[PDB]
């Protein structure tokens, strides 16, 4: 029902993904936003190079300034594509969360706490994702996977 569970990873976290992100796969991330968070991001990456920065197939970036939002994008050759902004964000400072990223054939479907949050169409074949990055101001209790 969940495997390869990592507990209380230090952030910034970079970790190799166990198996392939095929349709049906779930990535489950449970955590808590620190009272002073400005933003954090979950990146599904092709590799872990820092300079040059590895490509990010799916950058999921809750931001907490202003009214707060979530920005989703794809980084290729150190350049960002078209941003998809979601203004209805379930993330709050000092509040805990469960993020479920479901890999569908055509898109990612993201729900927080069991409620649908956003969709993001595949720009890179998800089969090429091999690394999970979590950066910014966030406390992660656990990361887990349920493949296929
Ligand atoms: O697109 C993801 C990418 O955004 C960068 O910041 C953008 C910002 O999202 C945009 O709304 C503002 O108007 O311009 C900035 C120019 O890049 C981030 O710096 C980056 O971390 C990613 O989150």
Curated annotation (Swiss-Prot):
Assembly notes: Homodimer. Interacts with CALCOCO2/NDP52. Interacts with PDPN; the interaction is glycosylation-dependent; may participate in connection of the lymphatic endothelium to the surrounding extracellular matrix.
Residues that hold a carbohydrate according to the record: 63, 73, 83
Q: In which tissues is it expressed?
A: Ubiquitous. Selective expression by prostate carcinomas versus normal prostate and benign prostatic hypertrophy.
Domain Galectin stretches: 13-146
Included range, full protein: 7 to 154 of 317
- Record remark on domains: Contains two homologous but distinct carbohydrate-binding domains.
The UniProt entry's coiled-coil ranges are: none
Site residues by UniProt (Critical for binding to sialylated and sulfated oligosaccharides): 53
Q: What function does the entry list?
A: Beta-galactoside-binding lectin that acts as a sensor of membrane damage caused by infection and restricts the proliferation of infecting pathogens by targeting them for autophagy. Detects membrane rupture by binding beta-galactoside ligands located on the lumenal side of the endosome membrane; these ligands becoming exposed to the cytoplasm following rupture. Restricts infection by initiating autophagy via interaction with CALCOCO2/NDP52. Required to restrict infection of bacterial invasion such as S.typhimurium. Also required to restrict infection of Picornaviridae viruses.
Name of the protein described by the UniProt record? Galectin-8
Q: Where in the cell is it found?
A: Cytoplasmic vesicle; Cytoplasm, Cytosol
């Amino acid at each position: 029902n969940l495997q390869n569970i990592i507990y209380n990873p230090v952030i910034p976290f970079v970790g190799t993904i166990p198996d392939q992100l095929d349709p049906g796969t779930l990535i489950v991330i449970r955590g808590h936003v620190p009272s002073d968070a400005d933003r954090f991001q979950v990146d599904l990456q092709n590799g872990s190079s820092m300079k040059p920065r590895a490509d990010v197939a799916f950058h999921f970036n809750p931001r907490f300034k202003r009214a707060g939002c979530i920005v989703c994008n794809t980084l290729i050759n150190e350049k960002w594509g078209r941003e998809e902004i979601t203004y209805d964000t379930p993330f709050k400072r000092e509040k805990s969360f469960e993020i479920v990223i479901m890999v569908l054939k055509d898109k990612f479907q993201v729900a927080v706490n069991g409620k649908h949050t956003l969709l993001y169409g595949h720009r890179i074949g998800p089969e090429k994702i091999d690394t999970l990055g979590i950066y910014g101001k966030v406390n992660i209790h656990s990361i887990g996977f349920s493949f296929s």
